[PDB]
Write a protein that binds this ligand. Structure first.
Ligand code: A1BQS
Ligand code: ZN
Length: 139
């Protein structure tokens, strides 16, 4: 679990969105596993606007942060699950590192700010849903 709070927006994994998230929906994209809902209290996370390929992510299954090198956002195959059938997930970034079901929502950060959130894993790899392209999150 985990969310990004920027301005009057809450950014979560689409498969983990709550009833409240859907009742205050701003935008959702099943192919990115992203959902953005509106909030009443102001958020103070800063979003990175860059093409950084190194950063640090929070892994809740180890209660630790890990430094990672990660690939550029692209179309990557994701196995079938209880939430989605087998498909290519867009805007996805891979890194070598520990992740297990329950780690989705952990933030990935660089010196510029929030890069994305954990969305996929397994095979000794971790996948991150990029948020850097969502320029409207700051307006
Ligand atoms: C099996 C699961 C996963 O990758 N899912 C299921 C939940 C939806 C994900 C998606 N379609 O974007 C794919 C998982 C395994 N290891 C680490 C994780 F953070 C998650
Ligand atoms: Zn950066």
């Amino acid at each position: 679990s985990g969310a990004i709070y920027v301005g009057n927006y809450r950014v979560v994994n689409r498969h983990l969105a709550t009833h409240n998230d859907w009742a205050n929906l701003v935008w959702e994209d099943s192919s990115r596993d992203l959902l953005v809902s509106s909030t009443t209290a102001q958020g103070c996370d800063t979003i990175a606007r860059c093409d950084c390929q190194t950063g640090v992510y929070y892994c809740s299954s180890r209660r630790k942060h890990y430094p990672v090198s990660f690939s550029k956002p692209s179309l990557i195959f994701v196995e079938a699950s209880e939430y989605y059938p087998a498909r290519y997930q867009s805007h996805l970034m891979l890194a070598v590192g520990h992740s297990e079901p329950g780690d989705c929502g952990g933030i990935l950060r660089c010196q510029h700010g929030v890069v994305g959130i954990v969305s996929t894993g397994g095979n000794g790899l971790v996948g991150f849903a990029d948020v850097r392209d969502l320029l409207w999150l700051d307006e």
